[PDB]
Design a binder for this molecule. Structure first.
Ligand SMILES: O=C(Nc1ccc(Nc2ccnc3[nH]c(=O)c4ccccc4c23)cc1)c1ccccc1
Length: 249
């Protein structure tokens, strides 16, 4: 179908990115609420990224999963690109974090679970190494998790350590996340980027004493240096800490 700025009335900003801004917006024709994301061919060029785009767009365009944010259309004009996207009313897991500083284990476990399925399907169709920082998780109207990705702490040992990664990478992220949710910050934070290198090659981290065994078990298996040792998803899903907690309607 053919899109055009004119078929959208434009709403309030929801964020300003590097190449542009995302907005709330509605399709004049169905009154369909969604998000619009605005790029400037201009800044795209000078960061020569148009290559990074046109790919991921494609990719995205294809994917369909409840937990991954949808990309509906994309259209362009004179001097910026438009990206039509699903709107996620409840915002990002990143503010949710800032706000509760920390998540309880049911919330975490459940979010993991989503991720895991997401990650799985995304894998199935042969796609990997998403950045899944918390500011690339949005929330659905149900608080249903959902993901949208298009530094650092979330890189694994085999990537910083300039070596050979696969989709186990996705298992590490998931550890970091699960750690970050529960504790509040990510397990290899550090002040300079070179402490973080270090921290990550020795996988050097520690739990606060409020963190249950269930969790430390899981987390630990995910955060292993040898890609091969870490679980796989349906294992993770099948972990007990998870099943015990994962509210799953
Ligand atoms: O630019 C892209 N991704 C993307 C991902 C998320 C958002 N922004 C939102 C979209 C929908 N709901 C949202 N809800 C929000 O609450 C929000 C808050 C801050 C920033 C963005 C959003 C946001 C905008 C763009 C993109 C590029 C290539 C492929 C796919 C997506």
């Amino acid at each position: 179908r053919q899109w055009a700025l004119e078929d959208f009335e434009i709403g309030r900003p929801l964020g300003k990115g590097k190449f542009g801004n995302v907005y709330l917006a509605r399709e004049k024709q169905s009154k369909f609420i969604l998000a619009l994301k605005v790029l400037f061919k201009a800044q795209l060029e000078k960061a020569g990224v148009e290559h990074q785009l046109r790919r991921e767009v494609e990719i995205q365009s294809h994917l369909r999963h409840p937990n991954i944010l949808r990309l509906y259309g994309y259209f362009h004009d004179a001097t910026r690109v438009y990206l039509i996207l699903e709107y996620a009313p409840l915002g990002t897991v990143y503010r949710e974090l800032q706000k509760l500083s920390k998540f309880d284990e049911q919330r975490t476990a459940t979010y993991i679970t989503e991720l895991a399925n997401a990650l799985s399907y995304c894998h199935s169709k042969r796609v990997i190494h998403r950045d899944i920082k918390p500011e690339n998780l949005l929330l659905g109207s149900a608080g249903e998790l959902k993901i949208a990705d298009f530094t650092l702490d979330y890189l694994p040992p085999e990537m910083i350590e300039g070596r050979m990664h696969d989709e186990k990478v996705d298992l590490w992220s998931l550890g970091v996340l699960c750690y970050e949710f529960l504790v509040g910050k990510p397990p290899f934070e550090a002040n300079t980027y070179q402490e973080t290198y270090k921290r990550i090659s020795r996988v050097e981290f520690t739990f606060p004493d409020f963190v249950t065994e269930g969790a430390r078990d899981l987390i630990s298996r995910l955060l292993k240096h040898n890609p091969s040792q870490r679980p796989m998803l349906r294992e993770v899903l099948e972990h007990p800490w998870i099943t015990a907690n994962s509210s799953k309607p």
